[PDB]
Amino acid sequence: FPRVKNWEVGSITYDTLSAQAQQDGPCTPRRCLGSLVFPRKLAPEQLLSQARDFINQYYSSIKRSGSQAHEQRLQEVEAEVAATGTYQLRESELVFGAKQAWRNAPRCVGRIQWGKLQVFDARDCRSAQEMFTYICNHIKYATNRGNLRSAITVFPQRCPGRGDFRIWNSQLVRYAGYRQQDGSVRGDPANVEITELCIQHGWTPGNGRFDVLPLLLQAPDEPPELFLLPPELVLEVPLEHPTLEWFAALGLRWYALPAVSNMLLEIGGLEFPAAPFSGWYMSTEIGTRNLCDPHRYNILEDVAVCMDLDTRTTSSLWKDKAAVEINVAVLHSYQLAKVTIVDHHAATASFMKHLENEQKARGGCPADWAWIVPPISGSLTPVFHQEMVNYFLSPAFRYQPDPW
Amino acid sequence: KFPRVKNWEVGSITYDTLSAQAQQDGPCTPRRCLGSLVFPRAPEQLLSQARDFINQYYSSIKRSGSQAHEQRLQEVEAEVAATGTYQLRESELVFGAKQAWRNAPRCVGRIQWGKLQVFDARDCRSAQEMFTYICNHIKYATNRGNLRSAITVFPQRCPGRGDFRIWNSQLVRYAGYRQQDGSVRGDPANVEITELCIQHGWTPGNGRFDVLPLLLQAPDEPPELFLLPPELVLEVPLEHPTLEWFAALGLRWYALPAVSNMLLEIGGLEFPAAPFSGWYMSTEIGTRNLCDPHRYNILEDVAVCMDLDTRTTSSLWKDKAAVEINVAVLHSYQLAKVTIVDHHAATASFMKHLENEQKARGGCPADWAWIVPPISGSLTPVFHQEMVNYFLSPAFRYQPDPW
Numbered sequence: 001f002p003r004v005k006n007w008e009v010g011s012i013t014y015d016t017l018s019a020q021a022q023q024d025g026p027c028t029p030r031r032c033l034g035s036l037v038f039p040r041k042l043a044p045e046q047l048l049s050q051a052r053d054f055i056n057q058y059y060s061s062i063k064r065s066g067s068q069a070h071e072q073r074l075q076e077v078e079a080e081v082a083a084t085g086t087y088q089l090r091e092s093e094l095v096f097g098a099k100q101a102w103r104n105a106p107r108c109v110g111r112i113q114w115g116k117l118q119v120f121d122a123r124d125c126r127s128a129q130e131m132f133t134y135i136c137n138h139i140k141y142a143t144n145r146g147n148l149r150s151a152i153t154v155f156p157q158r159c160p161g162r163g164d165f166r167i168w169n170s171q172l173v174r175y176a177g178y179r180q181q182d183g184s185v186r187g188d189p190a191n192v193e194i195t196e197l198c199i200q201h202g203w204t205p206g207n208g209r210f211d212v213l214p215l216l217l218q219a220p221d222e223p224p225e226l227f228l229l230p231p232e233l234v235l236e237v238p239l240e241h242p243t244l245e246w247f248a249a250l251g252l253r254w255y256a257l258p259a260v261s262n263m264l265l266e267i268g269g270l271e272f273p274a275a276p277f278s279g280w281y282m283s284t285e286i287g288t289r290n291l292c293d294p295h296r297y298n299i300l301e302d303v304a305v306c307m308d309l310d311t312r313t314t315s316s317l318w319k320d321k322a323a324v325e326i327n328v329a330v331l332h333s334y335q336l337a338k339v340t341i342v343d344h345h346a347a348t349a350s351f352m353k354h355l356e357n358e359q360k361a362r363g364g365c366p367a368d369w370a371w372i373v374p375p376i377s378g379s380l381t382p383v384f385h386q387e388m389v390n391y392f393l394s395p396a397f398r399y400q401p402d403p404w
Numbered sequence: 405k406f407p408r409v410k411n412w413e414v415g416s417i418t419y420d421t422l423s424a425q426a427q428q429d430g431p432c433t434p435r436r437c438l439g440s441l442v443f444p445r446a447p448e449q450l451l452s453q454a455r456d457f458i459n460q461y462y463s464s465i466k467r468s469g470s471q472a473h474e475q476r477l478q479e480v481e482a483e484v485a486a487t488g489t490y491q492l493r494e495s496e497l498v499f500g501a502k503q504a505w506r507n508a509p510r511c512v513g514r515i516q517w518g519k520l521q522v523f524d525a526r527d528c529r530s531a532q533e534m535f536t537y538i539c540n541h542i543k544y545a546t547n548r549g550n551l552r553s554a555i556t557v558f559p560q561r562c563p564g565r566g567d568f569r570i571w572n573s574q575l576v577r578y579a580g581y582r583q584q585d586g587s588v589r590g591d592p593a594n595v596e597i598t599e600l601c602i603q604h605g606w607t608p609g610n611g612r613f614d615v616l617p618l619l620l621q622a623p624d625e626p627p628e629l630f631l632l633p634p635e636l637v638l639e640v641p642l643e644h645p646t647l648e649w650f651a652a653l654g655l656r657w658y659a660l661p662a663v664s665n666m667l668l669e670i671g672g673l674e675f676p677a678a679p680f681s682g683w684y685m686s687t688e689i690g691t692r693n694l695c696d697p698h699r700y701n702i703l704e705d706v707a708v709c710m711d712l713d714t715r716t717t718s719s720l721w722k723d724k725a726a727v728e729i730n731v732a733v734l735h736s737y738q739l740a741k742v743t744i745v746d747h748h749a750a751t752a753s754f755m756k757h758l759e760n761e762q763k764a765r766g767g768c769p770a771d772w773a774w775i776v777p778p779i780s781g782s783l784t785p786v787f788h789q790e791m792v793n794y795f796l797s798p799a800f801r802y803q804p805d806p807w
């Protein structure tokens with residue numbers, strides 16, 4: 001049982017939940033790969049073991065473990081698989097499993113909210129046009145005029161024989177990235193490839209650096225078809241600064257809803273390769289990663305020029321001063337627009353309280369330090385001084401190969 | 405089957421073949437990663453470490469498999485058979501000290517690993533001689549502000565005799581005093597060593613920046629108290645180039661970071677006293693030592709004087725105050741003409757170290773959580789570099805406090 005110290009308070013806890021982590025991570029006694037973004041690489045007898053496990057923790061979570069319908073639900077799963085090789089989740093098990101998958105996500109700093117999750121059951125979806133209607137409903141419900149609400153939409157599970165539902169976009173809302181003669185990119189350089197695909201599947205490209213991409217939605221077996229997001233459904237935020245009057249003239253903007261649409265959801269042995277989920281943004285994701293990463297919009301030095309900062313020498317800390325003002329502008333602009341957002345100080349403090357809840361409720365909490373600590377002001381937040389244990393619990397969100 | 409490592413800023417991939425030679429076992433398993441923990445933790449096993457280190461030394465002098473190489477191997481095992489231990493040649497010790505620095509996964513300063521002055525104090529005889537050696541190390545390394553990396557190696561661990569130990573965790577530290585209020589005056593990290601110095605006869609001060617005396621332990625001896633001559637301890641008073649009230653806080657720091665409580669392991673031999681020093685990266689002082697809530701904890705004070713709105717976290721008052729403290733540190737050390745490197749220049753030089761080491765050895769052990777600076781992490785290039793953490797020998801290791 002790992003001993004875990006918080007160096008700011010001196011307090012000690014033991015992570016007993018880690019002894020139950022099954023699916024094995026990438027580290028060995030000889031070498032730690034904790035910093036790798038993608039670890040390593042990406043007979044129904046095994047299905048029964050994972051299903052009986054998940055049914056057991058479902059009935060634990062509602063007290064009713066021991067006698068009664070709990071004893072009953074285990075047999076239906078056995079009879080279901082013994083008759084079909086797979087099985088079906090009850091609506092309530094689906095809801096419980098999606099909340100656990102979020103609760104178990106070691107890289108997510110927002111898990112204090114894990115019990116408030118809207119789950120749309122789309123397991124009877126059978127069309128790409130139908131997928132588009134589900135996604136538009138999700139977007140409308142989650143955005144909610146700027147008062148964002150967490151939500152996931154669960155499309156039908158993978159089945160032996162005949163293909164998967166899949167969203168080819170990495171998020172429901174993304175900006176296009178266009179190459180040109182110098183190979184440099186206008187727009188978002190993270191999205192050049194999916195942009196290239198959208199064009200080669202019919203899309204007419206656009207103007208500049210904040211064009212919302214179309215959706216590439218794949219029904220089983222039939223190839224992907226393009227869908228155009230209606231502009232009144234995609235809420236965006238123009239970026240301005242509360243005292244730097246010229247900042248607005250930079251023409252920056254970001255979108256309201258972060259909706260990851262390329263991860264696979266696994267529950268009780270079943271795998272849902274299309275299950276897009278959404279919450280709301282932490283400001284450093286936009287202001288520090290999306291706008292300031294050198295391989296993203298890379299705007300830092302443009303802002304420093306406008307601030308008249310001494311870009312001639314690293315030790316003026318011009319990078320650091322410009323980054324702070326970009327995050328100030330993000331927080332200001334999202335508040336003015338009355339769109340939900342959370343700063344990295346508020347977010348990390350809630351994660352600490354979540355660690356305390358989880359210690360009492362489960363005896364630990366899988367956490368990935370490198371992703372929990374924010375990309376600016378790391379040691380100014382309380383999670384920097386908290387040791388953390390990283391491991392894999394199921395239900396889970398897992399990465400998966402792209403559909404190409 | 406060597407780990408594949410990606411840089412996300414540039415898109416480049418490498419393989420760390422060196423990790424396959426990892427000579428000890430860290431704390432992670434395939435069940436759970438413990439990479440974020442601060443402390444992760446005879447004759448025949450002495451001989452395998454010894455042979456391995458001799459092989460490394462003869463490789464570096466491009467003389468592997470020669471008869472001098474085999475002669476040294478044979479002499480070592482003969483000497484272990486006769487005495488239970490063996491003695492390093494002076495050139496082996498210089499090589500091994502440098503390799504220990506080169507192998508330190510948490511050091512971002514390793515581009516400099518070949519420029520290390522090695523002082524051989526293995527003849528040291530008492531605490532009084534140990535003090536003289538330490539004083540000359542401080543004088544040499546400080547060099548009136550133009551700092552030079554150095555290490556002083558005191559006698560090895562030996563069956564029959566106790567260890568030489570420096571009880572202080574650094575050669576220069578500020579006292580921490582418990583108070584009436586249960587608070588600490590000075591540096592709260594140094595409360596324990598401060599209490600030990602007093603109870604060994606030190607008359608304390610009562611300031612926030614009182615330099616501590618040294619407690620030096622000779623084999624089988626209680627530790628003995630030694631005062632550093634003040635003209636040896638170079639300090640930098642802190643000011644800010646455009647916040648004139650910052651000088652009135654009366655903040656100071658010392659020029660020389662000289663870590664003194666780690667064990668140096670070379671070829672199975674252990675040196676429990678081997679203090680080493682380089683020069684500061686400005687965030688160690690400005691963000692960790694001054695702003696950590698369990699250290700001097702000045703961040704709120706400074707933000708209030710800066711007239712920031714500290715009522716809400718969304719004003720980012722902590723990030724703004726922290727940036728200006730780090731500016732004060734850089735400006736103050738540069739004004740005093742004391743060597744200092746900022747976290748952007750340091751992380752850029754480390755990326756060049758990784759490239760050099762990929763060519764020389766096929767990899768580089770690195771602890772991402774310690775290499776990435778404590779502010780402005782993703783503004784530096786190391787943030788976007790995947791890294792592989794593992795233990796090579798020669799090495800610097802943590803060791804239990806001698807009390």
Ligand code: HEM
Nearest residue numbers: 102105107108109110113150151277278279280281282397
């Ligand atoms: C409600 C507010 C939320 C906040 C503030 C939040 C915050 C974050 C942040 C900052 C990250 C890492 C940033 C990055 O990957 O670049 C992250 C990752 C993640 N989030 Fe959350 N999140 C929220 C809601 C949710 C919801 C509703 C779900 C799922 C139902 C979720 C599941 C995940 C997962 C699985 C990851 C890791 C994803 C991966 O490894 O690719 N989060 N979150």
Ligand code: HEM
Nearest residue numbers: 505508510511512513516553554680681682683684685800
């Ligand atoms: C020359 C300039 C140097 C710089 C800028 C530098 C920088 C750093 C930094 C920023 C750290 C992490 C600090 C922390 O623990 O908070 C570190 C750790 C370390 N450095 Fe270096 N260093 C330098 C020289 C040296 C030398 C000369 C040695 C040994 C010969 C050395 C060995 C180590 C070791 C062993 C650690 C890890 C300490 C630990 O794990 O607790 N460094 N260094």
Ligand SMILES: Cc1cc(N)nc2cc(-c3ccc(OCc4ccc(C#N)cc4)c(CN)c3)ccc12
Nearest residue numbers: 037258260277278279280281282285293412413788
């Ligand atoms: C619900 C929710 C809210 C929110 N607010 N955020 C989220 C972020 C993720 C998430 C995971 C991995 C990512 O990315 C992988 C990656 C790793 C390294 C680089 C680099 N260099 C680039 C991308 C990115 C992109 N933020 C997001 C998932 C859900 C989120």
Ligand SMILES: Cc1cc(N)nc2cc(-c3ccc(OCc4ccc(C#N)cc4)c(CN)c3)ccc12
Nearest residue numbers: 007008385442661663680681682683684685688692
């Ligand atoms: C040669 C050299 C140059 C330089 N420029 N710097 C160095 C810094 C260290 C070093 C190691 C551990 C530390 O601390 C370990 C620790 C972990 C967690 C907490 C907490 N909370 C506190 C301390 C701290 C503190 N700087 C420094 C060692 C050598 C250095």
Ligand SMILES: C[C@H](O)[C@H](O)[C@H]1CNc2nc(N)[nH]c(=O)c2N1
Nearest residue numbers: 035036037370371787788789790
């Ligand atoms: C190389 C490194 O693993 C990579 O930059 C990681 C580090 N930490 C991160 N942390 C968050 N929140 N998001 C990220 O994409 C990353 N990327």
Ligand SMILES: C[C@H](O)[C@H](O)[C@H]1CNc2nc(N)[nH]c(=O)c2N1
Nearest residue numbers: 384385386387440441442773774
């Ligand atoms: C809890 C956490 O492991 C601890 O605070 C670490 C994180 N990274 C660090 N990185 C450096 N350079 N120095 C440190 O002391 C620490 N402390």
Ligand SMILES: [Cl-]
Nearest residue numbers: 258285286290
């Ligand atoms: Cl994003």
Ligand SMILES: [Cl-]
Nearest residue numbers: 661688689693
């Ligand atoms: Cl220090």
Ligand SMILES: [Gd]
Nearest residue numbers: 645646647648
């Ligand atoms: Gd001024």
Ligand SMILES: [Zn+2]
Nearest residue numbers: 027032432437
């Ligand atoms: Zn690990």
